[PDB]
Structure formats: C-alpha cells, structure tokens
Amino acid sequence: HHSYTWTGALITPCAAEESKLPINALSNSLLRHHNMVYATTSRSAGLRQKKVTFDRLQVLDDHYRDVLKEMKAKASTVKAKLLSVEEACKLTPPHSAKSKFGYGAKDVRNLSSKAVNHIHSVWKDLLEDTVTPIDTTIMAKNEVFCVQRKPARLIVFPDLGVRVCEKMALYDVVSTLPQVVMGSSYGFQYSPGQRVEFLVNTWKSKKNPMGFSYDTRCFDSTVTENDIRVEESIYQCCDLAPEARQAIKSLTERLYIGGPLTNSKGQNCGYRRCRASGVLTTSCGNTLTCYLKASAACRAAKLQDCTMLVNGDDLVVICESAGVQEDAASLRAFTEAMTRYSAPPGDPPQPEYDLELITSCSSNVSVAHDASGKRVYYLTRDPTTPLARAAWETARHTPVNSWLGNIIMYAPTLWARMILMTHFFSILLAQEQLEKALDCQIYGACYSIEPLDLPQIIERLHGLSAFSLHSYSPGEINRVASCLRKLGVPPLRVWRHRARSVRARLLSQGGRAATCGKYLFNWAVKTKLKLTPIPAASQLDLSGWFVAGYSGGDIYHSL
Numbered sequence: 001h002h003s004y005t006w007t008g009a010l011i012t013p014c015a016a017e018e019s020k021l022p023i024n025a026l027s028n029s030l031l032r033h034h035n036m037v038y039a040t041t042s043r044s045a046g047l048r049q050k051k052v053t054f055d056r057l058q059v060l061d062d063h064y065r066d067v068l069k070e071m072k073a074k075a076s077t078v079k080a081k082l083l084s085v086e087e088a089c090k091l092t093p094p095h096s097a098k099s100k101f102g103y104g105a106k107d108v109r110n111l112s113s114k115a116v117n118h119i120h121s122v123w124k125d126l127l128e129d130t131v132t133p134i135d136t137t138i139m140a141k142n143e144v145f146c147v148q149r150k151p152a153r154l155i156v157f158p159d160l161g162v163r164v165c166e167k168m169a170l171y172d173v174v175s176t177l178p179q180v181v182m183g184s185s186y187g188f189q190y191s192p193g194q195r196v197e198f199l200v201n202t203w204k205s206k207k208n209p210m211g212f213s214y215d216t217r218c219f220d221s222t223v224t225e226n227d228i229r230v231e232e233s234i235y236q237c238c239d240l241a242p243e244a245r246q247a248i249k250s251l252t253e254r255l256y257i258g259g260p261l262t263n264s265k266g267q268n269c270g271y272r273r274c275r276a277s278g279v280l281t282t283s284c285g286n287t288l289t290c291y292l293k294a295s296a297a298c299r300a301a302k303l304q305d306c307t308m309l310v311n312g313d314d315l316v317v318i319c320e321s322a323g324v325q326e327d328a329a330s331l332r333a334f335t336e337a338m339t340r341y342s343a344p345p346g347d348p349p350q351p352e353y354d355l356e357l358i359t360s361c362s363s364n365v366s367v368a369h370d371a372s373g374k375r376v377y378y379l380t381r382d383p384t385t386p387l388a389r390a391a392w393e394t395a396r397h398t399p400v401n402s403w404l405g406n407i408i409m410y411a412p413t414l415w416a417r418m419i420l421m422t423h424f425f426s427i428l429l430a431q432e433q434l435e436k437a438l439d440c441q442i443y444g445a446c447y448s449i450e451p452l453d454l455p456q457i458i459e460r461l462h463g464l465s466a467f468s469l470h471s472y473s474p475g476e477i478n479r480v481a482s483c484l485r486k487l488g489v490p491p492l493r494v495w496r497h498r499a500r501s502v503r504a505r506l507l508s509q510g511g512r513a514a515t516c517g518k519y520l521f522n523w524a525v526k527t528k529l530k531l532t533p534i535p536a537a538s539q540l541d542l543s544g545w546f547v548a549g550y551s552g553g554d555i556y557h558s559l
C-alpha cells in the first residue's frame with residue numbers, strides 16, 4: 001500500500017531551470033538580501049520522492065461510515081450536467097501543456113478539427129475502456145521561496161486530450177457538489193472577506209471558542225485507493241447522464257486511483273497509487289476526503305459543536321472548549337483518529353483561544369480600523385513568500401503573476417498596499433503597460449486581468465474600507481516589519497514617498513489610471529480624499545471568481 005514505486009529514472013526538467021534569484025535594475029529598490037530568495041528545481045526531486053513515498057494504513061470505523069452516508073445523502077440532491085467538447089475547450093488555459101498528439105492549448109481553444117477529433121477519440125476510449133491505466137507526466141515544480149531550502153514539489157498530470165475529457169464529465173460536478181455536501185464548511189465559496197466573516201461569526205457562535213488548524217503531512221500521499229473510490233461513489237450519487245457516469249467511473253479506475261509516471265524525457269519513473277496533484281478532481285477530492293476524515297475524527301475525539309472550514313488539504317476547526325485541559329486531550333484524540341484514517345499530521349495541532357492566532361490557507365484573521373475608526377476584520381498573511389515571488393517577477397516574466405493575485409486577495413493588508421501596489425504600478429507606468437492584461441490565479445483557476453480594473457475589483461471584493469484601513473494590529477505590524485528587515489526591504493517612509501510619486505503620475509494619466517492613483521494610494525497622502533463608490537465597479541462579472549477550488553485543475557476563466 002505504498003504511495004509510490006520508482007523504477008530509478010530521474011524526474012527530468014522540460015527546459016532550463018533557475019534556482020538563483022534573477023537580478024535587474026529594479027531589484028534593489030524592492031529587496032536587497034538576494035541570496036535569501038530561491039526557486040525549487042529538479043535537482044531536489046529526489047529528496048521529495050523520499051518524503052512522499054510511504055506505506056498507508058487505514059482503519060475505517062462507524063463514525064467514518066456514518067459521516068460518509070450523510071455526505072452521500074446530500075450528494076444525491078445534486079444534478080450535474082455534461083459539458084460539450086466546445087465548452088470544455090474554452091475552459092482550457094491559453095498556455096496549458098500541449099498534447100503529445102499533434103496539437104496544443106491554442107488549438108483546443110480554437111476548436112481546431114485535429115484537437116476536437118482527438119478529444120472525441122479519447123472520450124470514446126474512456127466510455128469503452130474502464131481498466132487501462134492512463135499515462136501521466138511527473139514534473140518538479142519551479143516555485144519561489146525564502147530560505148528557512150525546501151525540496152521541489154511534484155506535479156502529476158495526464159495529457160491535454162484527457163484534461164478536456166475530465167472537464168466534460170466532471171467540471172459541473174466539482175463546481176457544485178462540494179458546497180452542497182459541506183455547506184458553509186466549504187472554503188472555496190467564500191471571498192477573502194467572506195472567509196473572515198464566516199470565521200468570526202463561527203467563533204462568536206461558541207460560548208467558549210476553541211480553534212485549531214490541522215496540517216496533514218503531504219496530504220496527497222496519504223490519499224488511498226479507498227479514498228479515491230469513496231470519492232467516486234459520492235460523485236455517482238449525483239443525478240448524471242449515463243454517459244457521464246461511465247466517464248467518471250473510467251477516469252477513476254484508469255487515472256484518479258493510480259497510474260504510471262513518465263518524465264519529460266519519456267522514461268517510466270514508476271507508479272502512483274495516491275492522489276494525482278494535476279487532475280481536475282484534485283481540489284474537490286482533497287476537500288471531500290479531508291472533510292470526511294475530519295468530521296468523523298471530531299466524533300471519535302468527542303469534540304463539542306465542531307464547525308469546520310475545508311479548502312482542499314487545508315483544514316480549520318472551531319468548536320466549544322471544555323477547558324484548556326480537555327481541549328488538549330480531545331485534540332490529541334482527533335489526531336489519532338485522523339491518523340487512523342490515513343491522515344497523519346506533519347506538525348502537531350495546537351489549540352488556540354485567539355482567532356487571530358489561527359493560520360489556515362497560509363492566512364489568518366486580523367483587525368484594523370477604517371476612516372470612521374471602526375474595527376474591521378480582514379484576511380492577511382505572512383508576506384515573506386509573496387515578497388520573494390514579487391522579487392522574482394520583478395526581473396522575470398512568469399506565466400502566473402503572483403503579485404497581481406496577491407494584491408487582489410490581500411488588498412486590505414498593510415504589505416500588499418504599501419509595497420506590492422506601489423512597486424508594480426511604478427513598473428507598469430515606466431513600461432506603459434497599465435492596460436495590458438495579465439494572468440494570475442485565484443483558488444487555482446487562471447484569470448486574465450487588467451491592472452487598471454484593480455480599484456473596481458477591490459471595491460467589489462473587499463469594499464471601500466480596503467482603501468482606508470489604518471492602525472493595524474501590533475502583531476501584524478511586527479510581522480511585516482520583521483519580514484522587511486529579513487529580506488532587506490525599504491521602510492514605510494520610503495514606500496509612502498514612492499507612492500505619492502506613482503499616485504501623482506497616475507492622476508496625470510486620467511481615466512482608470514487616475515482612479516487607481518486616487519483609491520489605491522490614497523493612504524500615502526497627508527490630506528486623504530473622500531473616496532466614494534465607483535460607477536463601473538459593478539460592471540465586471542465576478543461570478544465564478546469564488547465558487548470552487550481548481551488547484552492543478554488546468555482551469556481558465558475568460559474575464
């Protein structure tokens with residue numbers, strides 16, 4: 001019952017890899033301690049293979065089955081539709097991994113006969129073959145981090161022709177079923193502010209609030225064949241077309257459960273018997289299995305009024321405290337249960353009685369004040385990784401601009417406004433690329449966004465308060481200040497100074513550019529403006545922005 005088996009072939013790169021932070025003329029103005037930023041590469045794939053390769057054991061008791069039966073009863077009320085080959089295609093990212101059968105993402109999006117005929121041949125093979133394992137490619141992701149060096153993560157994905165077929169049979173399911181089964185516990189249905197809201201209201205629901213985060217040690221590797229089959233049984237509970245049921249069954253047996261691993265060179269690296277990180281059901285699967293295991297664990301551990309918030313493999317639990325002494329005990333029992341369900345923790349979970357001290361989705365709740373001086377809760381996080389990535393994207397263009405994604409998700413934060421906004425807008429101005437659409441990610445899905453619409457976007461997601469927050473918490477202030485010293489990032493006084501400059505320049509521009517300068521940097525000027533609502537704000541269709549998670553799902557939404 002090992003998560004993986006390796007032949008011995010190395011996981012090879014499909015192009016040149018950079019580990020050292022690239023440096024240009026704009027680098028120093030943002031970060032000076034360059035040697036602290038790095039990117040993971042193949043050179044460490046070997047190290048990761050050892051950490052994710054182990055034997056999984058499972059003991060399923062009555063609590064587990066009782067929770068599963070409840071989840072299935074809700075799943076039965078779901079009606080999912082089959083997507084046409086045309087629809088699935090328009091959901092394919094413009095720069096997704098090209099197929100090894102004579103066509104690419106560009107051909108898919110354009111509905112090229114070659115790509116369409118191949119996708120149809122794959123779909124037919126799926127309905128007729130429910131046993132032959134589907135091939136997958138294993139790659140070492142190139143992610144940027146700040147020292148303390150972690151080994152590169154592994155991404156496993158099937159050929160483009162298959163990815164389009166997954167969408168057709170499962171897109172609607174992974175987009176609607178999660179919220180029906182888990183209700184308010186499904187995290188991907190909330191925007192940053194809504195997540196904070198649900199968290200605060202829940203915490204205030206308990207007489208004596210007690211919460212903790214649960215970090216599983218390499219969740220994907222703990223996912224067993226049983227878990228993947230249970231996932232399929234839940235999908236099958238939905239009202240689906242017979243053709244969709246067949247495809248879902250086939251994808252499960254042939255791909256989701258396991259399959260052979262092939263490096264970029266074409267060599268078999270081994271076999272997978274755990275969760276594939278690069279399939280459409282990765283987010284939904286991880287969320288359903290994590291919610292199922294934790295729900296049962298809360299019953300085994302005897303937690304009281306346990307409310308959960310699940311986002312893929314990330315779990316948050318808020319319940320009624322029974323005393324600092326009991327909490328610690330129950331929590332330990334919870335862990336044991338989870339472990340028995342094949343979900344061992346990497347780091348021992350610790351009970352918290354302070355909301356702001358609980359970190360989930362790499363983020364935490366915090367408080368600041370708006371113009372009126374009213375206390376306002378917002379979602380923030382440790383800026384280390386976001387800044388390290390900003391340094392990299394400062395000297396190197398990337399497929400996904402994290403700085404943009406981060407601004408959108410953390411616009412109300414001190415670090416995002418003060419540094420990310422000031423820095424990147426300064427650059428956009430110098431290159432006159434303000435109206436140039438850029439790609440970023442939100443819950444794993446890829447979105448094309450124009451920097452000039454940021455003000456309207458932020459208003460819709462966070463509210464005008466995002467443009468006037470001040471007097472942050474000491475805890476937040478120190479964490480930001482510390483990170484700045486660590487990386488060697490200029491102080492507030494510097495950014496404020498640069499912001500007035502960028503602001504004055506944006507105003508001069510006029511139109512959307514003036515709007516950006518007025519709302520995004522109003523915090524820099526001594527004489528703050530009124531900052532009223534924005535007209536075109538409600539013109540964008542931010543519908544599918546916060547519905548579900550698609551991490552590794554190769555999903556693209558044309559905004």
Ligand SMILES: Cc1ccc(S(=O)(=O)NC2=NC(=O)/C(=C/c3ccc(C)o3)S2)cc1
Pocket residue numbers: 413414417418469470471472473477491492493523
């Ligand atoms: C993006 C932004 C930047 C600055 C402001 S503010 O008007 O100077 N009010 C603040 N409140 C704090 O908690 C702050 C942290 C803080 C205090 C001292 C240092 C170095 O950082 S500043 C507002 C918004």
